[PDB]
Design a protein around this ligand. Sequence first.
Ligand SMILES: *[C@@H]1O[C@H](CO)[C@@H](O[C@@H]2O[C@H](CO)[C@@H](O[C@@H]3O[C@H](CO)[C@@H](O)[C@H](O)[C@@H]3O)[C@H](O)[C@H]2NC(C)=O)[C@H](O)[C@H]1NC(C)=O
Ligand SMILES: *[C@@H]1O[C@H](CO)[C@@H](O)[C@H](O)[C@H]1NC(C)=O
Ligand SMILES: *[C@@H]1O[C@H](CO)[C@@H](O)[C@H](O)[C@H]1NC(C)=O
Lengths: 163, 55, 120, 157, 55
Amino acid sequence: SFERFEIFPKESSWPNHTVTGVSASCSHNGKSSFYRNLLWLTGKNGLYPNLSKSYVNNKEKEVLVLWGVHHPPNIGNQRALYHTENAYVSVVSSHYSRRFTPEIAKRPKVRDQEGRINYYWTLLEPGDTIIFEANGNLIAPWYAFALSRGFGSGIITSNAPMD
Amino acid sequence: YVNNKEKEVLVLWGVHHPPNIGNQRALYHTENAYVSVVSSHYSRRFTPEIAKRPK
Amino acid sequence: QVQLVQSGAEVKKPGSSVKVSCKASGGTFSSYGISWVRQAPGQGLEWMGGIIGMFGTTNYAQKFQGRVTITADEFTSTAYMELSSLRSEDTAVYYCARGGSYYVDYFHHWGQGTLVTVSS
Amino acid sequence: IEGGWTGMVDGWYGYHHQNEQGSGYAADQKSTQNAINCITNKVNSVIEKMNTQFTAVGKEFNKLERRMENLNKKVDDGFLDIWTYNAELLVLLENERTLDFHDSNVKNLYEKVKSQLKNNAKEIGNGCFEFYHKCNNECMESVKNGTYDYPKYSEES
Amino acid sequence: EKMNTQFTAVGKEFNKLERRMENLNKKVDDGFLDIWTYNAELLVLLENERTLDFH
Ligand SMILES: *[C@@H]1O[C@H](CO)[C@@H](O[C@@H]2O[C@H](CO)[C@@H](O[C@@H]3O[C@H](CO)[C@@H](O)[C@H](O)[C@@H]3O)[C@H](O)[C@H]2NC(C)=O)[C@H](O)[C@H]1NC(C)=O
Ligand SMILES: *[C@@H]1O[C@H](CO)[C@@H](O)[C@H](O)[C@H]1NC(C)=O
Ligand SMILES: *[C@@H]1O[C@H](CO)[C@@H](O)[C@H](O)[C@H]1NC(C)=O
């Protein structure tokens, strides 16, 4: 079972960044939309100030965290979205750390989209802390899935009707 | 180093990741630094990942 | 082919107990009977006692009847000794023997033997 | 055959007699010794087949290699389940044969006595015979061992 | 009683670059099924003969 919760509230987490995520490929109800657990950051008024937010796990259960890195196709979309040709995103924790960079280059059309967004995940031990750093090309978390272990459960591929 | 022996030798090395620029400059006086280790059948290039981390 | 091997030579103080272990080469599970015999220096042999196959029935000569105890770990094909109350007359050679059958009948396999002496 | 003995020793299979020359249990060395050979060879075969020379030191994997740990765990658990089943099945199966093996030997010995001990001796059913002719140790051991002198005695016939 | 059945049998999947895992994992699953199938038949077939002779 899960205990889903809003790790970074939209209203207060990002008061200096545009938070409206728009994408045609992920349309919902025949309109623009985006993932429900993730969040697409963008700089308003031409500024993308560095965002440095960290979360502390005040629970006794491991929490799953998700974040993504944007890979715009060309320079035009890169500058118009973050106004920084060279951008980095860093995620660190007590026992985890790595630094990503945006890989800008044209790619074959998939789902009528040029760029890509790479998703990553990690598990935070109880009482641990995670620090999010970036200055562009980031997909910050909006929800997290705190999980509890259970014996006997598994994943199955089936199509029979339920009853 | 050249292995002048008939037995395999284990070698260890580490790369520093200072937290902020202040410790980086005061320790090596170079904002951008690289460390390279190569051999006959081994090679890779590391870079320091400077960023604040939880204590 | 099989080979009988005993422990090395030992010397014990008078009034003590001496233990000698007999083992057979390739000592897998075995049921052959075992016994012991003394060859005093310059004198003929004299029987001591032996075991009888799986049944583990032990018989000893009336000369001592209480001083020697033999038990065999058939799984390892080993025969032990628990001789006690050694004296000067007991200085002799002990040999390990097998009869080729579970009974204690005649013996036709012998080890290299062991020389045990008693003195201060 | 109906009921074992406790006074007898030095043999799994043995006879009995009550002649005036002396009453006492005895063992059939030839029959018992042959049985021991099969047991010794049978137990040895089990040990030899069950080899044990191999490396069993466990390994460990980091957090991101959960697939390795589950796959490695299954391999270890799988073999232990197989060996446990194989060990019990072989031991349980062999025990039944050994118990039946002794029955054939004792029963076979009983029939062998019947052939060598002709109708001159009356069978009373409970693993015993009654002789119509008085016999001493010389004749008693004749039945026990492989030589008998049936034509000599023809009393009550 | 001997034929225990309490264990986890949920299958796994691997990406394209882990073909070695899939072949190795596939062999482990196939190997045990072949062994158990042989063990199940041999024990049942062997026991039936004894029962018929037992009567
Ligand atoms: C089976 O058991 C019987 C009975 O124990 C054995 O009979 C024995 O036969 C031998 C003949 O080789 C007898 O030896 C001779 O006895 C006469 C008696 O007067 C003696 O004068 C001779 O000098 C010679 O010693 C022996 O006595 C006899 N047993 C008894 C108790 O009298 C038979 O040999 C046994 N057969 C086998 C194959 O074990
Ligand atoms: C957002 O910007 C304002 C000034 O424009 C600043 O005071 C505030 O600290 C920024 N947000 C955060 C979380 O610091
Ligand atoms: C963001 O980081 C860069 C890199 O050092 C720095 O120059 C800039 O001043 C930072 N932004 C703010 C608002 O401090």
